[PDB]
Amino acid sequence: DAHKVVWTEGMFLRPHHFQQAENYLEGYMRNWGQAHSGCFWGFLTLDLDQTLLRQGKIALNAASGIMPDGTPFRFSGAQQAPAPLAIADNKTGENVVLALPTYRAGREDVIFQESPEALARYLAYENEVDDLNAVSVGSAALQFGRLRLRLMLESELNAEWTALGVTRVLEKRGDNSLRLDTAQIPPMLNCQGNPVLKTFINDLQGLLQQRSQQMSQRLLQPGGSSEMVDFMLLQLINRHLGQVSHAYHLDHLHPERLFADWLQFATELASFSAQRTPEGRLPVYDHDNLALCFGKLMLLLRQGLSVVLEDNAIQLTLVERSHGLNVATVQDTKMMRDFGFVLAVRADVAAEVLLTHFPAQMKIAPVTRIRDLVQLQLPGIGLRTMPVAPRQIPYHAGYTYFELEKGGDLWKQMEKSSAFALHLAGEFPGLDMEFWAIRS
Amino acid sequence: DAHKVVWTEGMFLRPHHFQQAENYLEGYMRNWGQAHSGCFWGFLTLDLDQTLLRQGKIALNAASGIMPDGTPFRFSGAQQAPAPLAIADNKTGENVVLALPTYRAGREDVIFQESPEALARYLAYENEVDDLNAVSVGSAALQFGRLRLRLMLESELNAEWTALGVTRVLEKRGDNSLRLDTAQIPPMLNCQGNPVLKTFINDLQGLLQQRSQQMSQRLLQPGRGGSSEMVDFMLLQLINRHLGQVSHAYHLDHLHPERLFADWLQFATELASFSAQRTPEGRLPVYDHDNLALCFGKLMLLLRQGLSVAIQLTLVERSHGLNVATVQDTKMMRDFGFVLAVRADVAAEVLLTHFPAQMKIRIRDLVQPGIGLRTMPVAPRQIPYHAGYTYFELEKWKQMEKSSAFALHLAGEFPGLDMEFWAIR
Amino acid sequence: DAHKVVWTEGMFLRPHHFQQAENYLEGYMRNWGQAHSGCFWGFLTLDLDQTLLRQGKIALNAASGIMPDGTPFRFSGAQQAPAPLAIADNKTGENVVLALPTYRAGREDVIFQESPEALARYLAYENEVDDLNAVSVGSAALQFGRLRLRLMLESELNAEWTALGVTRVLEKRGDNSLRLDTAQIPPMLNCQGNPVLKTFINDLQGLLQQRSQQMSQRLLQPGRGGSSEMVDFMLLQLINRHLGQVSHAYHLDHLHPERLFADWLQFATELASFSAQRTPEGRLPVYDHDNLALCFGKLMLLLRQGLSVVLEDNAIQLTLVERSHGLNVATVQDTKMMRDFGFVLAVRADVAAEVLLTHFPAQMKIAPVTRIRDLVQLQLPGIGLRTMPVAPRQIPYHAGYTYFELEKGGDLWKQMEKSSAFALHLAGEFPGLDMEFWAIRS
Structure with missing residues (x-):
């Protein structure tokens, strides 16, 4: 002093x-x-x-x-x-x-x-x-x-x-x-004076121009929620076109200032991940280890800017055919492999009855095999009792959850199919079913 | 050195x-x-x-x-x-x-x-x-x-x-x-030091206050809705964020123009999402400390564009039972809808049934039926509030896309009548 | 001159x-x-x-x-x-x-x-x-x-x-x-030089972590796909941006208050979008370097109004900060807190209900940080957990969660009363565990 x-x-x-x-x-x-x-x-x-x-x-x-x-x-x-x-x-x-x-x-x-x-x-x-x-x-x-x-x-x-x-x-x-x-x-007082920082900026601006034009073009050529969510991402990208353009042209720019903007960008981006929120410890600015902290930050930014906007869980619609027979159409080809499936069941019998008799009387199969399964009296896809409703689907008190078991020759035919077939024998008083697909 | x-x-x-x-x-x-x-x-x-x-x-x-x-x-x-x-x-x-x-x-x-x-x-x-x-x-x-x-x-x-x-x-x-x-x-180190920059800030504030009241008023009231509704709420959020930003900039005793410019630039480029392009088009303005008039000039025009946005036609009397609805542009006549705000000293139930029949819109040929008039449960919010009126939408035919004015001729009496005729785009 | x-x-x-x-x-x-x-x-x-x-x-x-x-x-x-x-x-x-x-x-x-x-x-x-x-x-x-x-x-x-x-x-x-x-x-040149500013930051972060966790879990489940779900999603987005913003603030060794204020003011005025008024009403709070309690006070209010999910202060959520495996620490923000508030654990897991009702209350030992560890090796009890048959009206109730009140009484309670944080350790056989820790004013 x-x-x-x-x-x-x-x-x-x-x-x-x-x-x-x-x-x-x-x-x-x-x-x-x-x-x-x-x-x-x-x-x-x-x-x-x-x-x-x-x-x-x-x-x-x-x-x-x-x-x-x-x-x-x-x-x-x-x-x-x-x-x-x-x-x-x-x-x-x-x-x-x-x-x-x-x-x-x-x-x-x-x-x-x-x-x-x-x-x-x-x-x-x-x-x-x-x-x-x-x-x-x-x-x-x-x-x-x-x-x-x-x-x-x-x-x-x-x-x-x-x-x-x-x-x-x-x-x-x-x-x-x-x-x-x-x-x-x-430790840098100016991003312009270090080549790695300079191409962090340059690279991000490129990711943003690219996905910006991909999206604007498609939004320009389709009104669902899917469309709104995309517009929301485009909006977020568009804000960061301006921000990073400013950073790209600035003669002097302290890295801390850059890192603050981009961290906000990354956590807001996680809104579009399947998790909807940032996961795990966030990157923390370290002025004497910029490579560690901008490295993690850039990974998140790239994950975020490459995410496909997608539902994590959807309810399939059971459509009634012959007596006891329901059919649920899968959205597309790839759904069979990217999702697991749960059958929610409510009935006015004891849980003991439900657990013993319902799996025994339900046969799930691709549409192409359900007749064979009933005519020849063979099981369908297995059902595994879940202790409690999964978290991706809404809780409904009274319902018992069963996960469809994958694997085996029958499930392989299912993966080639577009619809589940659920054929139930007999009746259960007050029976109600929901059919859910959850991403893996 | x-x-x-x-x-x-x-x-x-x-x-x-x-x-x-x-x-x-x-x-x-x-x-x-x-x-x-x-x-x-x-x-x-x-x-x-x-x-x-x-x-x-x-x-x-x-x-x-x-x-x-x-x-x-x-x-x-x-x-x-x-x-x-x-x-x-x-x-x-x-x-x-x-x-x-x-x-x-x-x-x-x-x-x-x-x-x-x-x-x-x-x-x-x-x-x-x-x-x-x-x-x-x-x-x-x-x-x-x-x-x-x-x-x-x-x-x-x-x-x-x-x-x-x-x-x-x-x-x-x-x-x-x-x-x-x-x-x-x-070149300025403090925006408060130069009057052009200050009026920049003050003008963006006022304009944001204007659009803010403008948009919130519409969203507060019940209306038909539609795809624009959610987009409007999105834009109001964006404007609401910048009401705070610009208020802070307005009150700071010291503010460097580069900080102001970096904020407004992200604004302008988010703003472009609500233009027809859905994304900014062309070349962004670049901050130039020794040419603040040019860079801010460009940015400001981007902003005024983003923040920019119903008309009553006179029912002129010519006779009893017939009034002219001279549209002021034939352009108008196919992109706009048209609505009849109507109130009479008569029972609600009959005014909802009869009036749709004794008022049709070549006409005095037809008088000796007219265009469909549909009851509008909710009044469109672009028309000013009018308690107690019933709204009628003129059904969309093609004689009048090529003509230039409406002819309304109503059968007789609904005492104390009032009527407004509006076009919305 | x-x-x-x-x-x-x-x-x-x-x-x-x-x-x-x-x-x-x-x-x-x-x-x-x-x-x-x-x-x-x-x-x-x-x-x-x-x-x-x-x-x-x-x-x-x-x-x-x-x-x-x-x-x-x-x-x-x-x-x-x-x-x-x-x-x-x-x-x-x-x-x-x-x-x-x-x-x-x-x-x-x-x-x-x-x-x-x-x-x-x-x-x-x-x-x-x-x-x-x-x-x-x-x-x-x-x-x-x-x-x-x-x-x-x-x-x-x-x-x-x-x-x-x-x-x-x-x-x-x-x-x-x-x-x-x-x-x-x-008048402060570094937010970190003043305890009140520091707790503004720390409080806002915990609120944002709480609302983020909860909103995201609700949005994971498929909804009706209407405008109300979009509104929620728009707000989680706004919360998510500030998770990062406040994290940066929380970790910065040096941060001038005016910079923090400008961020929070914008947060507030955009949050007004979600209020009944849809847009800020009244005079906006104005940064005043020589009266930070006043101007930050108004801002913190607006943010709590926009983010709170309970009535006034009938209840306050405590953030469970993980600091080991199975160990969490809930700091309480007051020494009075432990005598004026009730305490509840909202719990959900991927186990059978009968298992959760029995094993959880036994395997979750709650005590003060100083006095925790022994109990685990000593195999002694901790504060008791009582199942609640109706969930409190003061906190949100998630259907499918179980709510355990902490049993007050005993000599262990007194140690807590003079402590400044709960410690919770759980014998971890609980896939999918999600917990919330609430304090409810009496």
Whole structure:
């Protein structure tokens, strides 16, 4: 905590005065900045040297940003950059970072001669500079500070540094070339300065233009609920056409802002999943692991933008034919395989009667075999008693639920069929049945 | 790129030291600010002086903002104000700007006598100031730096300046005065700072309030319904969301135009769902901080389109039993339906049975039956509320798609009669 | 008007140069900062000393933020905090502020001797500091400046001060202790610096999780396919968007209140679509940085009205937060809650009814977090669960669920009463389990 210097008349100026006055004005600006920005550290720009990478070292041609302690930085050129960092010929799967010593008054801040692991924040160097006034006398030689930025392994870090993550090496091959994890993303203050973020945006805009035009075309060429639900999705997509177009053209865009919009998009999208609500832990923004959090977020977005809008459960209509014989037509070809089936049954007999006699007297089969089953006296599809109404169908007190058992040669003919045939022998007083299909 | 000045135990102090240290601090600030603000330059405030515009002279009474290079500034009054720019009868169609020289190390940016060709950033000047301490000896004359802010033509600009658009003269008239394109918008850091942006916000608010009351009123009342009904409720939700958004924008003391633009853009593109395309068509507007009039101009037109939406024809008397229903367009006659609002001092039951028969709509041929008239259980909500009336829909034939007016002729008496005739599309 | 200083060659140096130079630089940064932040003043952190509340004193342990005039500040410890403010016997319902005098060139800005009624911004003090270089000779003694922050009454303010609101004194008890209006919210720069804002977020999230769970389950079942089902689906959609929005808010380490308000206002005005009025009626709530309790208060109301499925506050749902396998934790939001409310578990599972009625009440052990685990290994009982033959009229009744009231009484109940959360562990043989935990006012 750096305080403001008092300057009195008759005061003898010492280097400390300026040193402390700099400390204070820096804290002043840092306090102002940190009070109004929540993820204030990371890279505005970062250019890693790809050629140097063949020689088993990580170099930075240029970079700019803010360190975790609030220190701003910017360097362009090998003379200005941190020492390249060589990688062991055995170490593997290590995170590399760009670190800087934390300020401390209990230790020297500026040094004039480099040192292995010295914690000074600056290195002194000399440079001639012009006076700035029109009237002047010549130039002057000053000493300046050079932030002691440093590339090192994450494992080498300790409480005396602040670091932005830069990359991760996965392999030092035989020929000394470095295999980087091109997926790890650094802390970024601007999505525009990282290529992965940029194509997250670019990719999403493409998904949205694509499904936007698929839908608008079909809604333009059919009035059911199915149509309304689709219009609702198109509406949600259309909102995010504008949003992501703005993100696509913006010169500066903090990733947190982008992530907030897209997380809302993803949870609203889950409305159209079969579950109707987000499932499991939501992605949480992590400014120092953007790759993990935008990765999960992008998966949800892609699932959501690829979902086919579909019913999870529907009631089939029993249509009466000959005495005791009902037929329920399946919607389409694929329903037989994508669904399970439950027969709900109410009757004014004891449950003991229902459970023993009803399955025995009901024969379910594809229409093509029901006559054979009755004429030859063979069972149909099996019925399994469910303990309680499933959750996808409405509870009706008094009803007993039976699940149709799949598998076997009879069920295989059912999968080729378009209608169930339910032929019941005898009678049950007050009998009522519902026939339900539930997605698997 | 300015670096930290190192101060050492015996050092001999040169103005260079202070000068360089100020640069390093200013650039430390600039670097923090620019790391976290995308469109960081523009005006917070701008008060051009009309009084000087009868004189062919663009002058600012006051301004505050940040230059495109990051330089903060603020001034008010004749003294601190940059020189007014007097303009030529030559000039028509050009932007005026407020500019500052860039800073390069290879030239002075303090000068002590003014000279238009100098690229110096500050003009030095004299002022005496008191000590801030309570243990003081007295005041002291110092030299301060005045920011050399230029009012110049955009054509005059070159790589050795940065500038902010201030306006753009379209006409230097014969009356030694100019007409300004009041539709041009400076780069703004706060929407409340510029009147065009403010009227943008106020006008979208009023229009959303209008459509909001418009749509809710219809949905509140019973009516026939139809496929549009659910769509109308969808659009009202969307409008209801933006009533809050725009109210917040309306009340904020500080709002950056980019934030406003990003919200309105998603609005416009969701809005397109309720247009015939079902999705936006063409190329979206793109936010341009230095051309706010164009981008917002486009967006605003998208919005007015999305937020845009029954007529009573006079039953003119010509005789008893016959009134003319001159439709004012033959176009009208096949896309609109037509309804008879009818009330008579007679029993409800008979007016529902007889009146459909003694009023048919070549006609006096038929008088010596007419178009089907169907009872309308619920009145359409587009017709204004009329308690106690019975509504009749004229059955949709084809003699009158080619004619131009209806002829109603009713058989005799239903005392105290009243009648309205409406067309709905 | 803090202009730049011209350092010429051969200039004679005086204190004034450095003084005006710090003015100029401070003004540079302040203009930068203020140009890009509305509502830039307030607290990031605020720690009131409760122990001193008991002597008629308002004292700040620590605080940080920005004053309305642009001045950042940070302090900690009684050595640096402002002098505590004694509240007189008669003040009641008065606002206490943190204040600082405004900079004026016509007045001295540094004083060396504390005095009352002096509008100086700084108080000079002596300290000694090492050289930051290694070419160092040794430490040097300097005079630093310390911000003259001060706690005072809102009524004692004038234009020579800016101030941030800290709290309101409602009553000075007989024993000279003070009771504060805990509902008032200081101007805040981070929602996470204030407990009341944090619980707004946490409450809204739990409501959205509750309505989301319930509505989705109803929409899973096929309905009539009419407009009423579409309305429901439209609302779950609106709830689902804000599940994500509030999750982000809940997890952000730093979030300015104005940003949160703008989102919630839009949420509210779109929710009015589902009200009888179909559109907002009356004056909309307006963000007020210096009265967040008021403006958020109105917003929270609208959102509770639009989302509640019970009458006023006859009942409150508790979120069962899963924290292990079979273990859930229902935090209660009050210490009074456990003496004024009944407690019910709405349960449904894919087991046989006779199994659910017998096994559930035995296999679900309910107790306080501290006292849970032993019971499981100790195989002792927990709070009893009584089947309810009619479901409460105060909470929604899902046909097909069974409702168990918690048996009150015993000694175990007392431990709960003084606890702040239920712990529930269940011997898990229950496919399809869905539960709701409700508290019902008596």
